[PDB]
Symmetry: none
Subunit: 149 residues, 6 copies
């Protein structure tokens, strides 16, 4: 699902294929380093800091699954764990640096629970700024003091 969004040879973020859409955090500079994906029609929402595009048939096989079911506990991401409690995601400050946008936070069954956009460093833990689902909806949860990765 993760496809990197390059900008003049510099990887600036990522783009996941979640379900039937190709998502990419709007704030991220650059184009998707996949020919087919770059050529698509992207719709941009500044509200959700998103910029999605409906996936082509031949890529739907590589499309990941998403979910709203996000019980308190621990999740997985590129940089290890993600504590999830209080409708809030957190990672140990320093695991996520800029350039980590568009990465998915998934459960142990693979399902994508949310997509990182940035994070508010609050001591030992950074409270992640995310794009999450909600009973057939796409919400956006963002903490005060949040940077954009």
């Amino acid at each position: 699902c993760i496809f990197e969004v390059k900008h003049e040879g510099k990887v600036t973020g990522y783009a996941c294929l979640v379900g039937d859409k190709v998502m990419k955090p709007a704030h991220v500079k650059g184009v998707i380093d996949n020919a087919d994906l770059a050529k698509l029609a992207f719709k941009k929402s500044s509200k959700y800091d998103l910029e999605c595009a409906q996936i082509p048939v031949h890529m739907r096989s590589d499309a990941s699954k998403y979910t709203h079911e996000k019980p308190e506990g621990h999740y997985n991401w590129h940089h290890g764990a993600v504590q999830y409690s209080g409708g809030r995601f957190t990672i140990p400050t320093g695991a996520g640096k800029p350039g980590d946008s568009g990465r998915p936070i998934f459960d142990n069954k693979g399902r994508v629970v949310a997509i990182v956009l940035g994070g508010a460093n609050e001591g030992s833990r950074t409270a992640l700024s995310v794009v999450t689902w909600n009973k057939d909806m796409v919400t956006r949860v963002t903490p005060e003091g949040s940077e954009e990765w």
Copy 2:
């Protein structure tokens, strides 16, 4: 895309297949360690410190994509990041040593933003000497004090 250019058993640089051409920095000693590629007709420009050759049909599948879209920000390369600002690329002095020619600097979507030729060490940062694109053109940006890798 990267194919190493050997010289008497010593790897002296690299050669990327960007788009429909096989590029290789002219200054680099040796031949490409790929049978098919070595046998091609190479045209050499001393202006761009380049020596390209139009890719054979069977290798076009392994051909990478390139781009002029290079917004300020961060890029990826073999040795980590590449700061890109002021129409200038930079890496932390010491990441790129000689023998790193022909390596591509790409964005997060894979697209090749530029190709390293060498670099001018200016303290903590080395300003890279590169071959970059420009709205259907191949330009060459090189800083004063530049060595050839």
Copy 3:
């Protein structure tokens, strides 16, 4: 046998399939991260801090074996050893942190001897709070000063 019980993306404990039932410590927040298991009919006992459910035919193959035969000596668990003496289980303080509920303590032949619920830290050793068997019965042994993991 171990299946993790997630709560909003945060793993809060575990659930083992011991024999013909699927056990889970009642105190644990969340749902079992296995589709089939979540959908079952769970009966809850506050007496035993348990919440079991009779296993479906297709999962009985992955069902572990249990036993009352627990002679003094050493047992195995996720975090190494477990001293067992005086009808009491103990682990070196610090091996078991919260989030370790529902984990089994087994013998060298695989049989599950007990299931952790929490533990009373008493110096170098923590005396474990467990669910154990007893000649075709399910007992619960818990020490004073016990926390819930």
Copy 4:
């Protein structure tokens, strides 16, 4: 010759096939982790801290040779050397910890000279408690202050 004697997944000692019998130190908890060997008829002597069983034809090939010829000097064991003098075996304190029962002490020609049961730590050297041969007999030599391994 060495076959480990497991007890609830915990290796508690060993069992060697010396000559035509399968020996095992009686004090050791558990069963032999070899199907065929477990099923045999074991005779137990509390005098010699032994529990032998006459070897099956198909295993006699893997049966080791034993000997009474034990001249003063050095012997081999799992944990290096064994000083042998004064009708006494010794190893540097700390080489043999509990769980080392049933291991053989052999000569440079392979012959098994004795079988460890435990040992009396007497400073830098521990004087081993052993089962040894004696002109077609099985004797047992044990020092004061001996533990059982």
Copy 5:
């Protein structure tokens, strides 16, 4: 070729099958830990500190080859190198400890050039006491200050 000579469970030296004979340094206590070899007729020479026995047909396949051709240079042994110069063998003091008798020193083609009996520690180098060949003869070279291993 190497077969260990055990003494009451303590390995005291070794025995190599060189050519058509089974050699063993006479000074070594114990019996050969190979049934067939122990049962043979051994002839002992105190002159050569040897005790050879003509090899049985079924073991001749595992018999090693020997040679008198020993040009100055380096040889191989269990404990690395062996300098050979001045009709003298040497190893760095400390490579060979007692219990290393009967070990062969061979060339890069496998041929056994000599058999260790002991050695005279003379500083950084120990000059080995050996049994060597000499145009269809078995000689014995031994340095002043030699111990027996």
Copy 6:
């Protein structure tokens, strides 16, 4: 190509099969540790510190290739790199100790560029004494202060 030249069990140098001849530095004591090679007719030149012999048909397959093409740059040898500039070879003082004669210095394509005979230690770099080719000739380059390895 490299075959070691032993002397009384002590490896004193080497012998490479370069092209159609078997070369060996004349100064080296001992015989080649290869039966077939030892039996050949060797011609010795004191001028070139060489002692070559025309290779037998069955060994010509294992014969290496040589070359006069030696452009300034870096070469390979047993002990790493070899700087080559000013018609001179050099290695960092200490890489080549005595006993390194007859070793080849080759290019990245395998071709043997020269054969070491010894070297003049001149500080941090030792300027190698070599046997090199020259448009269908065998020359010998040797620096003042050269030892023989």
